Amino acid sequence: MKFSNITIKNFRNFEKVNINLDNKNVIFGMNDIGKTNFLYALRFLLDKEIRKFGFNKSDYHKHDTSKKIEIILTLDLSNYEKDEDTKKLISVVKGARTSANADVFYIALESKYDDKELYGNIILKWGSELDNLIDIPGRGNINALDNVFKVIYINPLV
Amino acid sequence: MKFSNITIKNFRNFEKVNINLDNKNVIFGMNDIGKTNFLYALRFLLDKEIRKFGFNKSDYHKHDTSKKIEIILTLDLSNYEKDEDTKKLISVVKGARTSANADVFYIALESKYDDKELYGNIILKWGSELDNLIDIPGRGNINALDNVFKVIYINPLV
Amino acid sequence: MSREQIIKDGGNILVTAGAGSGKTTILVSKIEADLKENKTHYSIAAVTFTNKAAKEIEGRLGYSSRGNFIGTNDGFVESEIIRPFIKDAFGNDYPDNFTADNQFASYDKGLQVLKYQNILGTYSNPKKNFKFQLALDILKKSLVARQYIFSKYFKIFIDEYQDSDKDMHNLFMYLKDQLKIKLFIVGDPKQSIYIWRGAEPENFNGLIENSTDFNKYHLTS
């Protein structure tokens, strides 16, 4: 029904940032580097064609690959009765929810670098409780989260 | 220890082909299209950077996406005592083997087209018995089969 | 004939069809018509009594990325209601692991077996069902279970309703009334030879002779 918050840690020039959200969001400022990295973090979390690749050594904050990248998004499911997107989410999620937490949901991203193979693997989790998340199931190249969200990217150039 | 055979069905210009193999293999002929598609099938089975993408509508035989692509490779594990590559394979596989079939192993690829999403998903299986195969486990973008095989591709151009 | 009046009807339907009528053909036609017509995220569930019919319908329908359930009514509860939401209704101690010898004649012993023994229970008396009463118990104690069931399916196809216990009727009617999910029932009144497994023919006949929100058709082909 509603986007609420996003947290980003140890990703590019973000070290620990917490941003409140809504359905419509406008980002502006003079940095022009964090503004693009914000949308890249969103694409990594929700876009399968970007997440299809991994994380490089330059994707870690300060290029220190001994730290973990966390990106966590929060939703509000309060209008299940009046909304049909809440049903679209709830029909793919079954069991990861509890009744005491029937109005909040979490989608998380985690990455730890492999020094031997020089690769950063991305693993996704959801859950209602932030201290108990489980892997999103999937077969092959497809994910259960890919069945819900369609991310359309618009750019005048490229 | 030894490659034995490979079967390819409904993939590009291959309809039903069965080829016996060894450790060293040389392919020659005048077709020049099947010769490249042979190596592409090998890359799809064993290369994660090629399998990372899916199958298009042009990857199906006769462009008939109502048929299933199967690629199956066979190995011989007879020299477990004298070979250290048999141990490299056996240490990642644990349970998919049975004692009655302790000398033969299978690695398979299957794809069925999705007409609504216009995507061909690839799902891998191994097993000792060809009538009982199970999905290769993995987390995120990584597979248990990626821990064993390293595919080096050489081409004078590109 | 009336086979064209069914595909054009959307809602609660009965089909009182005898042996040799072609129940599978009309069921598959209706399923395909419903799937083609609808453009939403919802799915369908087809529940049968044997794995043979389930596999036949699975083969006839084909392949899709839309999540539809085709199988036996015993697998329906295990896959959708019990295994995912058992711990949300009773507690975290109740396990969701099971691979079903250990039958008893009480309901409490069924929970005891499922918990301590970690295997699905059963009943010695074939006139009572443990699966379909536990499923209804879970549905009335878990809000997320009802939410998932409502958000997931928009129609459920049921065949051979004459060979249904009272618990199956209770669960299906709970889904139809409290959750507002459509039903499609097909059955032969004079094929209750399975009464040795606790079948109650009274339910189908009562539905035929008393239901007011059900559309009724008969097939003589």
Next chain:
Amino acid sequence: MSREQIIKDGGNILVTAGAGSGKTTILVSKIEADLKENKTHYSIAAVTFTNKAAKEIEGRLGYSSRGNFIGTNDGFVESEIIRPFIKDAFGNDYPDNFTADNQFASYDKGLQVLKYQNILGTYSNPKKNFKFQLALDILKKSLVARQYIFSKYFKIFIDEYQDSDKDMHNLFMYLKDQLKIKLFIVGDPKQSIYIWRGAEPENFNGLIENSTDFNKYHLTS
């Protein structure tokens, strides 16, 4: 001191170290040295008696894509020997599902519980072990189990050997002798206060006073 003679030794080793010696430090140092030295596909297994020590060692070592087992000795068998290869030894009817109240006093009833009840068994007498005898039984009946164990690990680290039953000793010695896997044993002879759980201090003392293929060191720091 002798702490430098251990890191330079590769093979079977004992470390008779008392309380306050720093067993964790030397264990982690040896593990890191072995991992850094070896460039093959093999791994190591660290078996403890508590989850606290397991987590401490896990945190100290760090992160790697190499598959090393760090945990309790009860989880070792379940994860490596029993769950994967139970059906290859006895048959396809024996289940690999379990979530472990239901303890008994016989081995056959333990198998019956595991099969019919679908839950791991136990013993009422603490002087006998069900897990570590079933594991050894499976190892002697499955060729693929032995093959995997040999192909997987090149060294196993064991701590607190004084609190070990006879079944644990039997399994570890089977691995050491029949499968030719190195062992690293650390234990305090005078810390058998856990004898209420069936601990047998005689095994560690016998190894110290009779072993001929074991290198022995003592730590006084």
